[PDB]
PDB file of C-alpha atoms and ligand atoms in Angstrom:
ATOM      1  CA  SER A 228     -16.834 -13.967  -9.135  1.00  0.00           C
ATOM      2  CA  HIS A 229     -15.904 -15.302  -5.265  1.00  0.00           C
ATOM      3  CA  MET A 230     -14.893 -11.424  -5.618  1.00  0.00           C
ATOM      4  CA  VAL A 231     -12.798 -11.216  -2.520  1.00  0.00           C
ATOM      5  CA  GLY A 232     -10.126 -13.558  -4.315  1.00  0.00           C
ATOM      6  CA  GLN A 233      -9.245 -10.800  -6.776  1.00  0.00           C
ATOM      7  CA  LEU A 234      -7.585  -8.208  -3.532  1.00  0.00           C
ATOM      8  CA  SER A 235      -4.405  -9.103  -1.278  1.00  0.00           C
ATOM      9  CA  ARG A 236      -6.391  -9.804   1.566  1.00  0.00           C
ATOM     10  CA  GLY A 237      -3.139 -10.190   4.119  1.00  0.00           C
ATOM     11  CA  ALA A 238      -1.780  -6.591   2.277  1.00  0.00           C
ATOM     12  CA  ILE A 239      -3.032  -4.000   4.882  1.00  0.00           C
ATOM     13  CA  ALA A 240      -1.863  -6.006   7.925  1.00  0.00           C
ATOM     14  CA  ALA A 241       1.538  -6.672   5.455  1.00  0.00           C
ATOM     15  CA  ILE A 242       1.960  -2.827   5.046  1.00  0.00           C
ATOM     16  CA  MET A 243       1.191  -1.704   8.541  1.00  0.00           C
ATOM     17  CA  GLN A 244       2.915  -4.047  10.669  1.00  0.00           C
ATOM     18  CA  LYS A 245       5.539  -6.425   8.643  1.00  0.00           C
ATOM     19  CA  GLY A 246       6.694  -2.961   6.884  1.00  0.00           C
ATOM     20  CA  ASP A 247       6.542  -4.822   3.648  1.00  0.00           C
ATOM     21  CA  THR A 248       7.637  -1.798   0.689  1.00  0.00           C
ATOM     22  CA  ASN A 249       7.769  -4.965  -1.628  1.00  0.00           C
ATOM     23  CA  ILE A 250       5.035  -6.224  -2.276  1.00  0.00           C
ATOM     24  CA  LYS A 251       2.366  -5.031  -5.074  1.00  0.00           C
ATOM     25  CA  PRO A 252      -1.116  -5.895  -3.638  1.00  0.00           C
ATOM     26  CA  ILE A 253      -4.168  -5.766  -5.441  1.00  0.00           C
ATOM     27  CA  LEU A 254      -6.606  -3.337  -3.394  1.00  0.00           C
ATOM     28  CA  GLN A 255     -10.022  -1.772  -3.831  1.00  0.00           C
ATOM     29  CA  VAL A 256     -11.261   2.248  -3.886  1.00  0.00           C
ATOM     30  CA  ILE A 257     -13.923   2.561  -1.420  1.00  0.00           C
ATOM     31  CA  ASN A 258     -13.359   6.516  -0.767  1.00  0.00           C
ATOM     32  CA  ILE A 259     -11.628   9.588  -1.962  1.00  0.00           C
ATOM     33  CA  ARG A 260     -11.797  13.028  -1.020  1.00  0.00           C
ATOM     34  CA  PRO A 261      -9.568  15.958  -0.655  1.00  0.00           C
ATOM     35  CA  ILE A 262      -7.822  17.241   2.246  1.00  0.00           C
ATOM     36  CA  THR A 263      -7.577  20.887   3.228  1.00  0.00           C
ATOM     37  CA  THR A 264      -4.749  22.187   1.470  1.00  0.00           C
ATOM     38  CA  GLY A 265      -4.174  25.912   0.737  1.00  0.00           C
ATOM     39  CA  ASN A 266      -1.908  27.630  -1.825  1.00  0.00           C
ATOM     40  CA  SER A 267      -0.729  24.696  -3.260  1.00  0.00           C
ATOM     41  CA  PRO A 268      -2.200  21.387  -5.393  1.00  0.00           C
ATOM     42  CA  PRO A 269      -4.869  19.169  -4.343  1.00  0.00           C
ATOM     43  CA  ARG A 270      -4.583  16.477  -2.001  1.00  0.00           C
ATOM     44  CA  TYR A 271      -6.072  13.120  -2.292  1.00  0.00           C
ATOM     45  CA  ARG A 272      -6.920  10.948   0.949  1.00  0.00           C
ATOM     46  CA  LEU A 273      -8.104   7.502   0.172  1.00  0.00           C
ATOM     47  CA  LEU A 274      -9.943   4.869   2.046  1.00  0.00           C
ATOM     48  CA  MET A 275      -8.960   1.755   0.398  1.00  0.00           C
ATOM     49  CA  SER A 276      -9.961  -2.190   1.224  1.00  0.00           C
ATOM     50  CA  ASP A 277      -7.496  -5.537   0.758  1.00  0.00           C
ATOM     51  CA  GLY A 278     -10.754  -7.626   1.180  1.00  0.00           C
ATOM     52  CA  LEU A 279     -10.384  -8.322   5.207  1.00  0.00           C
ATOM     53  CA  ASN A 280     -10.018  -4.849   6.450  1.00  0.00           C
ATOM     54  CA  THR A 281     -10.494  -0.998   5.252  1.00  0.00           C
ATOM     55  CA  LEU A 282      -7.473   1.569   6.382  1.00  0.00           C
ATOM     56  CA  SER A 283      -8.030   5.844   5.418  1.00  0.00           C
ATOM     57  CA  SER A 284      -4.530   6.391   6.163  1.00  0.00           C
ATOM     58  CA  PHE A 285      -3.295   6.603   2.654  1.00  0.00           C
ATOM     59  CA  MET A 286      -2.296   9.887   0.626  1.00  0.00           C
ATOM     60  CA  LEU A 287      -1.835  10.109  -3.189  1.00  0.00           C
ATOM     61  CA  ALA A 288       1.366  11.504  -4.608  1.00  0.00           C
ATOM     62  CA  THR A 289       0.247  14.477  -6.553  1.00  0.00           C
ATOM     63  CA  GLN A 290       1.786  13.407  -9.774  1.00  0.00           C
ATOM     64  CA  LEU A 291      -1.207  10.900  -9.994  1.00  0.00           C
ATOM     65  CA  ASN A 292      -3.883  13.728  -9.332  1.00  0.00           C
ATOM     66  CA  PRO A 293      -5.181  13.563 -12.792  1.00  0.00           C
ATOM     67  CA  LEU A 294      -6.529   9.698 -12.327  1.00  0.00           C
ATOM     68  CA  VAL A 295      -8.837  11.247 -10.395  1.00  0.00           C
ATOM     69  CA  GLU A 296      -9.888  14.456 -11.638  1.00  0.00           C
ATOM     70  CA  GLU A 297     -10.086  12.365 -14.851  1.00  0.00           C
ATOM     71  CA  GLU A 298     -11.819  10.075 -12.791  1.00  0.00           C
ATOM     72  CA  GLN A 299     -10.425   6.991 -13.881  1.00  0.00           C
ATOM     73  CA  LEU A 300      -9.299   6.312 -10.179  1.00  0.00           C
ATOM     74  CA  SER A 301     -12.642   6.929  -8.446  1.00  0.00           C
ATOM     75  CA  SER A 302     -14.901   4.740  -5.719  1.00  0.00           C
ATOM     76  CA  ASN A 303     -15.236   0.835  -6.374  1.00  0.00           C
ATOM     77  CA  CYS A 304     -12.240   0.388  -8.723  1.00  0.00           C
ATOM     78  CA  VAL A 305     -10.136  -1.971  -8.053  1.00  0.00           C
ATOM     79  CA  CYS A 306      -6.137  -1.028  -8.706  1.00  0.00           C
ATOM     80  CA  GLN A 307      -2.396  -2.303  -8.082  1.00  0.00           C
ATOM     81  CA  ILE A 308      -0.036  -0.658  -6.119  1.00  0.00           C
ATOM     82  CA  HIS A 309       3.566  -0.845  -8.160  1.00  0.00           C
ATOM     83  CA  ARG A 310       5.293   1.873  -5.890  1.00  0.00           C
ATOM     84  CA  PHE A 311       4.353   3.186  -2.129  1.00  0.00           C
ATOM     85  CA  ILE A 312       6.108   4.889   0.365  1.00  0.00           C
ATOM     86  CA  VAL A 313       5.301   4.672   4.182  1.00  0.00           C
ATOM     87  CA  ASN A 314       5.864   8.000   6.318  1.00  0.00           C
ATOM     88  CA  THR A 315       4.983   7.841  10.250  1.00  0.00           C
ATOM     89  CA  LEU A 316       4.320  11.200  11.804  1.00  0.00           C
ATOM     90  CA  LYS A 317       5.299  12.722  15.168  1.00  0.00           C
ATOM     91  CA  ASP A 318       2.401  11.226  16.689  1.00  0.00           C
ATOM     92  CA  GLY A 319       3.022   7.579  15.926  1.00  0.00           C
ATOM     93  CA  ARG A 320       0.500   7.324  12.907  1.00  0.00           C
ATOM     94  CA  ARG A 321       2.005   6.035   9.620  1.00  0.00           C
ATOM     95  CA  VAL A 322       0.866   7.389   6.406  1.00  0.00           C
ATOM     96  CA  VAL A 323       1.016   4.949   3.244  1.00  0.00           C
ATOM     97  CA  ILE A 324       1.971   7.036   0.335  1.00  0.00           C
ATOM     98  CA  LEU A 325       0.309   5.952  -3.135  1.00  0.00           C
ATOM     99  CA  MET A 326       3.035   6.877  -6.125  1.00  0.00           C
ATOM    100  CA  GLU A 327       2.173   4.124  -8.849  1.00  0.00           C
ATOM    101  CA  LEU A 328      -0.817   2.311  -9.134  1.00  0.00           C
ATOM    102  CA  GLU A 329      -2.429   0.702 -12.561  1.00  0.00           C
ATOM    103  CA  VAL A 330      -6.484   0.689 -12.472  1.00  0.00           C
ATOM    104  CA  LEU A 331      -7.203  -2.803 -13.523  1.00  0.00           C
ATOM    105  CA  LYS A 332     -11.038  -3.204 -13.395  1.00  0.00           C
ATOM    106  CA  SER A 333     -13.327   0.556 -13.100  1.00  0.00           C
ATOM    107  CA  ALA A 334     -15.697   1.409 -10.782  1.00  0.00           C
ATOM    108  CA  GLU A 335     -18.456   1.541 -13.268  1.00  0.00           C
ATOM    109  CA  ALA A 336     -16.972  -2.294 -13.917  1.00  0.00           C
ATOM    110  CA  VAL A 337     -17.020  -3.575  -9.991  1.00  0.00           C
ATOM    111  CA  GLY A 338     -20.075  -1.002  -9.025  1.00  0.00           C
ATOM    112  CA  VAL A 339     -19.981  -2.471  -5.430  1.00  0.00           C
ATOM    113  CA  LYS A 340     -17.355  -3.035  -2.147  1.00  0.00           C
ATOM    114  CA  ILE A 341     -16.227  -6.145  -2.585  1.00  0.00           C
ATOM    115  CA  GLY A 342     -16.515  -8.113   0.870  1.00  0.00           C
ATOM    116  CA  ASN A 343     -16.731  -7.216   4.433  1.00  0.00           C
ATOM    117  CA  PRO A 344     -13.731  -5.859   5.167  1.00  0.00           C
ATOM    118  CA  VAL A 345     -13.203  -4.335   8.628  1.00  0.00           C
ATOM    119  CA  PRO A 346     -11.463  -1.339  10.029  1.00  0.00           C
ATOM    120  CA  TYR A 347      -7.598  -2.288  10.238  1.00  0.00           C
ATOM    121  CA  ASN A 348      -6.621  -0.723  13.937  1.00  0.00           C
ATOM    122  CA  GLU A 349      -3.455   0.560  13.938  1.00  0.00           C
TER     123      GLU A 349
HETATM  124  O1  3J0 B 419      -6.971  18.512   5.706  1.00  0.00           O
HETATM  125  C1  3J0 B 419      -7.232  17.216   6.381  1.00  0.00           C
HETATM  126  O2  3J0 B 419      -8.324  16.270   6.220  1.00  0.00           O
HETATM  127  C2  3J0 B 419      -6.101  16.174   6.456  1.00  0.00           C
HETATM  128  C3  3J0 B 419      -4.626  16.476   6.524  1.00  0.00           C
HETATM  129  C4  3J0 B 419      -4.179  15.419   6.709  1.00  0.00           C
HETATM  130  C5  3J0 B 419      -2.606  15.203   6.447  1.00  0.00           C
HETATM  131  C6  3J0 B 419      -2.082  15.829   5.588  1.00  0.00           C
HETATM  132  C7  3J0 B 419      -0.340  16.037   5.640  1.00  0.00           C
HETATM  133  C8  3J0 B 419       0.244  15.283   6.371  1.00  0.00           C
HETATM  134  C9  3J0 B 419       1.731  14.635   6.409  1.00  0.00           C
HETATM  135  N1  3J0 B 419       2.168  15.044   5.243  1.00  0.00           N
HETATM  136  C10 3J0 B 419       2.796  13.821   4.725  1.00  0.00           C
HETATM  137  S1  3J0 B 419       2.616  12.279   6.410  1.00  0.00           S
HETATM  138  C11 3J0 B 419       3.173  13.158   3.246  1.00  0.00           C
HETATM  139  C12 3J0 B 419       2.366  13.947   2.247  1.00  0.00           C
HETATM  140  C13 3J0 B 419       3.380  14.026   1.700  1.00  0.00           C
HETATM  141  C14 3J0 B 419       3.905  12.870   0.981  1.00  0.00           C
HETATM  142  C15 3J0 B 419       5.038  12.537  -0.531  1.00  0.00           C
HETATM  143  C16 3J0 B 419       5.699  12.454  -0.739  1.00  0.00           C
HETATM  144  C17 3J0 B 419       6.011  12.391  -2.284  1.00  0.00           C
HETATM  145  C18 3J0 B 419       4.502  12.584  -2.402  1.00  0.00           C
HETATM  146  C19 3J0 B 419       4.418  13.368  -3.385  1.00  0.00           C
HETATM  147  O3  3J0 B 419       4.843  13.176  -4.954  1.00  0.00           O
HETATM  148  O4  3J0 B 419       3.446  13.919  -4.261  1.00  0.00           O
HETATM  149  O5  3J0 B 419       3.874  12.710  -1.297  1.00  0.00           O
HETATM  150  C20 3J0 B 419       4.987  12.366   2.361  1.00  0.00           C
HETATM  151  C21 3J0 B 419       4.552  12.661   3.304  1.00  0.00           C
HETATM  152  C22 3J0 B 419      -0.341  14.153   7.301  1.00  0.00           C
HETATM  153  C23 3J0 B 419      -1.816  14.314   7.230  1.00  0.00           C
HETATM  154  N2  3J0 B 419      -5.164  14.417   7.034  1.00  0.00           N
HETATM  155  C24 3J0 B 419      -4.610  13.273   7.205  1.00  0.00           C
HETATM  156  C25 3J0 B 419      -4.657  12.789   8.491  1.00  0.00           C
HETATM  157  C26 3J0 B 419      -4.154  11.402   9.240  1.00  0.00           C
HETATM  158  C27 3J0 B 419      -4.433  10.446   8.186  1.00  0.00           C
HETATM  159 CL1  3J0 B 419      -3.717   9.065   8.415  1.00  0.00          CL
HETATM  160  C28 3J0 B 419      -3.645  11.149   6.708  1.00  0.00           C
HETATM  161 CL2  3J0 B 419      -3.695  10.260   5.125  1.00  0.00          CL
HETATM  162  C29 3J0 B 419      -4.014  11.945   6.381  1.00  0.00           C
HETATM  163  N3  3J0 B 419      -5.987  14.832   6.610  1.00  0.00           N
END
């Protein structure tokens, strides 16, 4: 209730602008999809929301793949990010790798996209 109050509004901008990595923000998963990988473990890319912004530049550490494959981490769930790393590509784009996270509320217990977040412009 006041659902957006459940999310760390402003965390996406803090990660991408300030380079803040000590925060443990609470974010909503909007979408998850596999990337094209070949002969190596699958890799998942996530569209995440902090209630104000969405950002599609997240990938999951492969050690967390079971959370996706066993359906605990899925679209609409709310999770707390306990550890993440930022990397920057040759072309300037930043990628956030999610290393440790906790699902606070399952997709089924939330059920909808929270608020009206808008895409973050890098
Ligand atoms: O096949 C595809 O569709 C497809 C493909 C990619 C795409 C794929 C790869 C890279 C480069 N590899 C980077 S950044 C990377 C990957 C893993 C790690 C890492 C550290 C620790 C761990 C772990 O434990 O698993 O993993 C650190 C850096 C860029 C892009 N993308 C893609 C393009 C743009 C963005 Cl912003 C994002 Cl997040 C993904 N789409």
